[PDB]
Design a protein around this ligand. Structure first.
Ligand SMILES: Cc1nccn1-c1cccnc1
Ligand SMILES: Cc1nccn1-c1cccnc1
Ligand SMILES: Cc1nccn1-c1cccnc1
Lengths: 245, 178
């Protein structure tokens, strides 16, 4: 992540991120809504950062330092460039909505009143089709990636030294290779939980309540399609084992 | 330190997310209780042994039968949760959660955990449950379910007051080490 965004999302909540004199000007219901919107953006910023650790620290580091057989790095990090493009673009839209809402003279005081339309756009049309195709591919390659990682760590000395080196810093404690893969798989199922709680506090404007209800429905349709499109790939699996599923 | 992995499973209203949040922060948040839990790696020292215990939640995966099992690879200990204010969450333990965990995590110890124990003597909870001819889960009902499903053990906690929370994770670390 970049320092400007990390500082804007360093606080545990929206109520602690804004100035107390600004917080005091809002009703409790607005504060509850803003705290959940802030958590959605903060966790999206962290999710994009997990994808950057996968692409820049692990993937590119292996290509530039190690002598792995072709197709091995892609097997460890399936779809990471596509996933990074989807979420970096989504994160850009969320952060621009916050930036437009800032009060003049402030870099921290804002209220986002219209999130629903942005979520409907993300979870409909071509961007939803790309999310569905990419997560169906990623989640079907998840078990294979973990097994390839374990095999390489147990048998390749230079691979083990590389992993221990780049995961040594305290800031990588939660972000080893296997931890990154499960963090990405689990991201998509966090969206309905966050959207439902934002909706619970967005009844004040009927257009907003309707837009968040539509967005929640689109996210659930996407998840159902992804879930129905998954079948774990296994290295060396035989056709007979596949057609006898 | 040796690395171990913990996964918590249970119905949507069982309190698993709150339990992970309270343990990982060592506090019931005073300003904002997070909606979700990403992951955490706890440094735990139990009975003289140092362990890095990676913590994972299955919240949000309850309706997705092909995504949910992706949380299980290489799990060392399972916390199987139910809420004491929800006798319905306990009924789904033996024939939904237990066969799934035994299939994907063979030979992994399961600790059955009764969450929200503070609601057992809460008048509002007793009134709401009495309308459906129900009462908060009794301690013997939790122990009998744990015995029946082949659990490593039975424990209770309250994320709200923090009571019993440290003990659950220290025992989970001992189970993962065996
Ligand atoms: C006083 C305060 N500072 C940050 C948040 N809050 C707050 C406001 C209302 C209820 N609870 C906490
Ligand atoms: C490989 C594995 N270990 C535990 C569970 N799984 C698994 C199997 C099939 C689909 N998803 C996850
Ligand atoms: C195959 C499967 N997917 C999700 C859960 N299960 C399951 C359920 C019961 C027993 N064994 C596996």
């Amino acid at each position: 992540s970049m320092e400007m965004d990390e500082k804007d999302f360093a606080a545990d909540s929206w109520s602690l991120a804004v100035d107390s004199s600004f917080l005091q000007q809002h009703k409790k219901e607005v504060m509850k809504q803003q705290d959940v919107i802030y958590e959605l953006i903060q966790t999206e910023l962290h999710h994009v950062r997990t994808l950057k650790i996968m692409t820049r620290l692990f993937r590119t580091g292996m290509l530039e330092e190690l002598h792995l057989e072709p197709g091995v790095v892609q097997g460890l990090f399936p779809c990471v460039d596509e996933l990074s493009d989807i979420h970096t673009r989504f994160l850009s839209q969320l952060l621009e909505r916050r930036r437009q809402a800032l009060c003049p003279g402030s870099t921290r005081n804002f209220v986002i009143h219209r999130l629903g339309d942005l979520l409907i756009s993300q979870f409909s049309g071509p961007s939803a089709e790309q999310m569905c195709k990419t997560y169906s591919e990623f989640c079907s390659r998840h078990s294979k990636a973990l097994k390839l990682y374990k095999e390489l760590y147990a048998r390749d000395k230079r691979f083990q030294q590389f992993i221990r080196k780049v995961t040594r810093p305290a800031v990588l404690k939660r972000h080893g290779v296997q931890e990154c893969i499960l963090l990405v798989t689990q991201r998509i199922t966090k969206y309905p939980l966050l959207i439902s709680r934002i909706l619970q506090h967005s009844h004040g404007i009927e257009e907003e309540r309707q837009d968040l209800t539509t967005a929640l429905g689109l996210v659930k349709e996407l998840l159902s399609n992804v879930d129905e499109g998954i079948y774990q790939l296994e290295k060396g699996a035989r056709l007979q084992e596949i057609y006898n599923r | 330190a040796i690395r171990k992995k913990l996964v918590i499973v249970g119905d949507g209203a069982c309190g698993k997310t709150c339990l992970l949040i309270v343990f990982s922060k060592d506090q019931f948040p005073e300003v904002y209780v997070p909606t979700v839990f990403e992951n955490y790696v706890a440094d735990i020292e139990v009975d003289g042994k140092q362990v890095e215990l990676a913590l994972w939640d299955t919240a949000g995966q309850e309706d997705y039968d092909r995504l949910r099992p992706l949380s299980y690879p290489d799990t060392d200990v399972i916390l199987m949760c139910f809420s004491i204010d929800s006798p319905d969450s306990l009924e789904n333990i033996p024939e939904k959660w237990t066969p799934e965990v035994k299939h994907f995590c063979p030979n992994v110890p399961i600790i059955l955990v009764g969450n929200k124990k503070d609601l057992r003597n809460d008048e509002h909870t007793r009134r709401e449950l009495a309308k459906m001819k129900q009462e908060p889960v009794k301690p013997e009902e939790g122990r009998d379910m744990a015995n029946r499903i082949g659990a490593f053990g039975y424990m209770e906690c309250s994320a709200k007051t923090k009571d019993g929370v440290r003990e659950v994770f220290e025992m989970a670390t001992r189970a993962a080490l065996q």
